[PDB]
Enzyme design. Sequence first.
Site, PDB file in Angstrom:
ATOM      1  CG  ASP A   1      -6.940   2.091  -1.197  1.00  0.00           C
ATOM      2  OD1 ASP A   1      -5.738   1.851  -1.088  1.00  0.00           O
ATOM      3  OD2 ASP A   1      -7.705   1.482  -0.520  1.00  0.00           O
TER       4      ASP A   1
ATOM      5  CG  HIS B   1      -4.895   0.342   3.955  1.00  0.00           C
ATOM      6  ND1 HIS B   1      -3.884  -0.871   2.918  1.00  0.00           N
ATOM      7  CD2 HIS B   1      -5.479   1.390   3.169  1.00  0.00           C
ATOM      8  CE1 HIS B   1      -4.370  -0.290   1.557  1.00  0.00           C
ATOM      9  NE2 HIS B   1      -5.831   0.554   2.020  1.00  0.00           N
TER      10      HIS B   1
ATOM     11  CB  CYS C   1      -0.776  -0.230   0.780  1.00  0.00           C
ATOM     12  SG  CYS C   1       0.097  -0.071   2.565  1.00  0.00           S
TER      13      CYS C   1
END
Length: 278
Positions: A266, A250, A206
């Site tokens: 995202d 994250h 991520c």
Amino acid sequence: TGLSESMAPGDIAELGRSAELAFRVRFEGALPPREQLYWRALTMERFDGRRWAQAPQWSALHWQKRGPELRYDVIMQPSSQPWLFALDVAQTDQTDTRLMSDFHLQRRQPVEQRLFYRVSSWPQALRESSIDPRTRWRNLQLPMHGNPRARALADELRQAHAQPQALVAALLQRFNHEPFAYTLKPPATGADGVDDFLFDTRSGFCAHYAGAMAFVLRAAGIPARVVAGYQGGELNPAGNYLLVHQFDAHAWVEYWQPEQGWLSVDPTYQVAPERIEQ
Ligand code: EMC
């Protein structure tokens, strides 16, 4: 032991290996779907070539409540940091905590003992349809040198896509159509870490995707920043609460345009949608 003011991928990976509890949450009504559970902690608005880092904030911040209001209680483990976790945009019952200029919650003192707080969040709030000039400026900062291939890509995208929504969509489509890999043990990258990830290794987690995406947006003249927090959590049906562990750490992105304001995105969803959804 928790999030810090700076993020390089290695720090996130270390949290990925830890089973320590970060916080627990109990919702007043129904549990939102997993893909809405983005527990915002802080933003990182400075990029120095190697890592994303927090910049100084201040408190009027322009935003507007709209859409559904989510209400929940949190019990937070000690973090040694002064930020509280919450869904964007949050208001809490803590009189020593303020929503800062980057829409994160800052407490007067670091959280050194367990803390219970109550929160109301508006996930569809309109954020800065007009923006503070300092914030706009800060969120266009990049080093003059380094990552020239990513800068070249940004320039190309800017020429082909006058509207930010279309440019963001094209960058997301690169992650989705090129054979990018999502892995927690990616190959190392060098000094041009954005270029190396985007064009050479195309493999990371991520933090790589979020950092690279925010980089390219900025280089295309769209203000953008990295958001650090947690996503998801584990449901305990016997107590009707969610557990959020360090391993849920994250990183994602948000980008600004006039009228629409800040919009969250995202890029991990383009390569590992299962991780976000399940
Ligand atoms: C800890 C993997 Hg984003």
